[PDB]
């Protein structure tokens, strides 16, 4: 129960450790999803004189 | 989280290493009390 109780600690902590690196990874990828939005704003340059 | 993952990675490796060492270091302190009582 040193091994079992500290491994029951670790088997959950490694899941949250992996999920927090995956949230950091999904957020450094969501930087590229906001960069496709910034690319739309960069392409709107485009159109003609109004009235 | 990884601080407590490194905590088992001391704890487990330590209880395994201390088990197989102190088996001989304390068995060789019961063997000498058997010498004193025989």
């Amino acid at each position: 129960d040193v091994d079992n109780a500290s491994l029951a600690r670790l088997d959950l902590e490694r899941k949250v450790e992996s999920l927090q690196e995956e949230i950091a990874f999904l957020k450094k990828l969501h930087e590229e999803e906001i960069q496709e939005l910034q690319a739309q704003i960069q392409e709107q340059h485009v159109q003609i004189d109004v009235d | 989280l990884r601080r407590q993952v490194d905590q088992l990675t001391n704890d487990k490796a330590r209880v395994e290493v201390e088990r197989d060492n102190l088996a001989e270091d304390i068995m060789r302190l019961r063997e000498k009390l058997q010498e004193e009582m025989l």
């Binding site: 091994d3 079992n4 491994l7 | -």
Partner: peptide, 30 residues
């Protein structure tokens, strides 16, 4: 799997000392 391999290591170490002591009892009868 490392925690199971650490519990079976305690079972190994306990059962080794138990059968080493029963062997040491049979040598003591000898």
């Amino acid at each position: 799997a490392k925690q199971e391999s650490t519990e079976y290591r305690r079972q190994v170490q306990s059962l080794t000392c138990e059968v080493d002591a029963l062997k040491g009892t049979n040598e003591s009868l000898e």
